[PDB]
């Protein structure tokens, strides 16, 4: 119990590992990977076809009972051919436990909408469509939610520039707000911060 180091909890690590393979045994058709982090969080990585079967099972199964969708989001990794990682964070009140379910898609492949499983997923999928451009099939009402009306692009993609492409001002001649190509009085100053010395040997990739 060194004072500055976060203590381990092996009991939680063991319990989550056992449940991880329990889920893999029951849904082998869709489960591609199961892992538990060193701070005791369980992740199920699945084929995208399994979004509805897997999420239904975790919600309704008597030994799972993940009734609450805490969060639904996406991550963009341009180096992958399926660049978008879709992440579901679920909470089980009955068993006081959390689980993460992850799948993937590319710019042109639809993902089945999870609104039938969780009504909470409605706006989360609109946000993912808005910020990443991932289409969700059978969504009752898919449209932008955060961006401006008529906004072009998906800002949270890694290749969308920080300041975008257009900016707004009031123009007296046309007596309205107009959109024009972005110019910055002071360009954002890119910093190269990474140290050229490796920090964490435990995570070194093979050469």
């Amino acid at each position: 119990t060194r004072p500055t180091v976060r203590p381990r909890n092996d009991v939680a690590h063991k319990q989550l590992s056992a449940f991880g393979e329990y889920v893999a045994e029951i849904l082998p058709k869709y489960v591609q990977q199961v892992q538990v982090s060193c701070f005791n969080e369980l992740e199920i990585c699945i084929h995208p076809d399994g979004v509805i079967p897997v999420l239904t099972f975790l919600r309704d199964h008597s030994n799972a009972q993940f009734k609450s969708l805490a969060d639904l989001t996406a991550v963009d990794i341009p180096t992958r051919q399926n660049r978008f990682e879709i992440v579901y964070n679920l909470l089980s009140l009955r068993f006081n436990s959390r689980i993460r379910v992850k799948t993937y898609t590319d710019e042109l492949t639809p993902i089945e909408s999870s609104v039938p499983v969780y009504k909470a997923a409605n706006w989360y999928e609109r946000e993912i469509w808005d910020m990443f451009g991932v289409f969700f099939a059978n969504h009752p009402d898919l449209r932008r939610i955060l961006t401006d009306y008529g906004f072009e692009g998906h800002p949270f993609r890694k290749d969308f520039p920080l300041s975008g492409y257009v900016e707004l001002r009031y123009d007296d001649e046309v007596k309205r707000v107009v959109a024009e190509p972005v110019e910055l009085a002071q360009e954002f100053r890119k910093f190269d911060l990474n140290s050229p010395w490796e920090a964490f040997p435990a995570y070194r990739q093979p050469p």
């Binding site: 002071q186 954002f188 100053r189 910093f191």
Partner: protein, 176 residues
Amino acid sequence: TYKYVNLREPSMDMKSVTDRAAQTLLWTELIRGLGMTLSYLFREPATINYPFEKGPLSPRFRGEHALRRYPSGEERCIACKLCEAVCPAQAITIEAEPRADGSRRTTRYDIDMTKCIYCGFCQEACPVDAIVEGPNFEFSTETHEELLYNKEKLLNNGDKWEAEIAANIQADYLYR
């Protein structure tokens, strides 16, 4: 542990039922609410007489920025650019070169006070206490341009406010 906020069955005896009828017909609970606002009418108000009286502040207050000097009059800033690196808003802009006596000193030190989030990271990062956030908060301007501070403005602020800034630093530097 938990408690129920609203789970109580009213008593159905004659006295209780007649107490509730009086409350309904004679508005007793509404009259009680009138008593509370009446008691406030006769309390001393909490208002202070600004600008003749001021709200209290502490030595840690983060206000207008200033560039400081050593007791000799030399500038403290040696253009390390730690403040510029840490600034969450990228509100600081710095240029530097050797001074005519070889000193390491800035030729530009701008703070865009309309970018700045007044977070105090720059004064935490400074190794020589050159850049600080002073105690002034009454510097609203009539134009946007007046809030784009260059080094001359920031040095004047330091010269203007140093008497208070040094006393504030004295009060709080043992907490840093």
